[PDB]
Amino acid sequence: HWGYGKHNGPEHWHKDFPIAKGERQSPVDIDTHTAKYDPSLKPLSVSYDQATSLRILNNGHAFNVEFDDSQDKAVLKGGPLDGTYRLIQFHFHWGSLDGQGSEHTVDKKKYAAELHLVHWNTKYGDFGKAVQQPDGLAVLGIFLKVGSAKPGLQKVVDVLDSIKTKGKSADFTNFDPRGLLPESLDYWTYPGSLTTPPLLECVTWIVLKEPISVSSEQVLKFRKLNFNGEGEPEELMVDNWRPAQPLKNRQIKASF
Ligand SMILES: Nc1nnc(C(F)(F)S(N)(=O)=O)s1
Numbered sequence: 001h002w003g004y005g006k007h008n009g010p011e012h013w014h015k016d017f018p019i020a021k022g023e024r025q026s027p028v029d030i031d032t033h034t035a036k037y038d039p040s041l042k043p044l045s046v047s048y049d050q051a052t053s054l055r056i057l058n059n060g061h062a063f064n065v066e067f068d069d070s071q072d073k074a075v076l077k078g079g080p081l082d083g084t085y086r087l088i089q090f091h092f093h094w095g096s097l098d099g100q101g102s103e104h105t106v107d108k109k110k111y112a113a114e115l116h117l118v119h120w121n122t123k124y125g126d127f128g129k130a131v132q133q134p135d136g137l138a139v140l141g142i143f144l145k146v147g148s149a150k151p152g153l154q155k156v157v158d159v160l161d162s163i164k165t166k167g168k169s170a171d172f173t174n175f176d177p178r179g180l181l182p183e184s185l186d187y188w189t190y191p192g193s194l195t196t197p198p199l200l201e202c203v204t205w206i207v208l209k210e211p212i213s214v215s216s217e218q219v220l221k222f223r224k225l226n227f228n229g230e231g232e233p234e235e236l237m238v239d240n241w242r243p244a245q246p247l248k249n250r251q252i253k254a255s256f
């Protein structure tokens with residue numbers, strides 16, 4: 001099935017998922033000189049004080065930190081969004097080397113990794129109905145650069161050794177995602193898609209301008225994870241990013 005290798009990677013996905021060549025695919029290159037400041041944009045509201053993490057899972061492509069989304073505990077509102085979007089999970093994309101790993105690029109610059117916090121529109125009642133709607137999801141993306149350590153990331157780094165291979169999971173309660181956010185909430189926003197199969201065109205992307213810093217040692221532990229299952233030959237989980245897709249005369253709007 002799909003992956004990130006030469007024989008099942010991004011350039012192959014369109015055969016099973018034709019929407020890969022669609023009109024609003026993600027990620028994209030953010031040309032900062034062409035993005036336009038949008039005064040219609042309301043301020044962004046990230047309300048994560050009640051967030052309830054439950055578990056972390058290696059899904060064979062990345063790891064997901066899962067939240068309890070059976071109530072309005074952690075939500076994203078405002079900015080370009082109408083309504084309330086509830087946090088369901090976050091995950092990362094990262095590279096084999098510090099010069100690559102992000103999915104979005106900024107003036108063609110690639111970061112070492114990208115964090116995605118995935119939220120769904122509560123008006124659609126559940127995640128699987130929301131991904132079938134053009135405004136069903138809101139994903140907050142945050143770039144990672146290598147430099148000083150991110151203290152709030154270390155509890156994630158700490159548990160990765162217990163979910164090395166595909167299908168492993170570990171308990172991950174009481175994790176606070178507020179510890180992953182940069183100081184500034186300035187952002188770029190555009191309509192796009194999931195960046196993995198099934199590549200559904202349901203996402204309002206909100207990409208923060210300010211990256212967070214993580215240490216070399218932290219990202220190195222990311223790179224010790226495995227795409228394969230236990231007892232199979234080691235395939236390091238690296239370069240699980242989709243490259244930039246054609247913008248197709250969407251306009252990227254800036255909040256600043
Ligand atoms: N892991 C993944 N979880 N969600 C994924 C997505 F494809 F939906 S993304 N990269 O947020 O568009 S990747």
Ligand SMILES: [Zn+2]
Binds near residue numbers: 091093116195
């Ligand atoms: Zn993602």
